[PDB]
Amino acid sequence: VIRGNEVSQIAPGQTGNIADYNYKLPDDFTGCVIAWNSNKLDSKPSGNY
Amino acid sequence: PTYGVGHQPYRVVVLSFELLHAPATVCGPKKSTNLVKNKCVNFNFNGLTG
Amino acid sequence: PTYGVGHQPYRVVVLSFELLHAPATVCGPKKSTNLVKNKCVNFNFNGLTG
Amino acid sequence: YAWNRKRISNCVADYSVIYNFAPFFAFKCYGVSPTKLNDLCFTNVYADSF
After folding, report:
1. CA-CA to B8 of 20 to 30 Å: which in A14, B1, B2, C19?
2. Distance in angstroms (rounded) separating the CA atoms of residues C1 and B38
3. How many CA atoms lie within 13 A of D21 on its CB side?
4. Where in this protein does the record put region Disordered (chains B, C)?
């Protein structure tokens, strides 16, 4: 799970904050990326920590 | 839940493949066919067409 | 209505166009102009310029 | 029709703090890339809001 800003940085050859410190994809990546909204599954009114 | 759409939860599943170089283990539901020799035919060897 | 955004119902309308090969019948309120001859002029015939 | 224009000059700019302020998806940058904006220097910045 990631945030809304960080969806674009899961891509080959793209730097940032989450792509160079958490999860780096190779520049010759041959595969698929799936992303979907999770408002009713991974959220709490008091704060999901 | 009061945040905007740019801070919302997002689940991400990344599927990564390897392009051959090994005997294939995961393959689709395409039905195999018996071999034929000494005839110019169209072949499909593990996704390699020709 | 409680389903996710990927399975929500969408209304789609596609507009298919035909490019020439017939007299033009569908265009707008752009005003026509009286014809002139024997002058190097910009023409605009049914949507083609020059 | 009456958009404000703010001139930004004589300061260093950290472009990683823009994301925490508003719930937007991503930058739409022409000519430069948003990830490489931290490393090059400019002369004048203009900000318009509407």
Report:
1. A14
2. 61
3. 4
4. 21-43
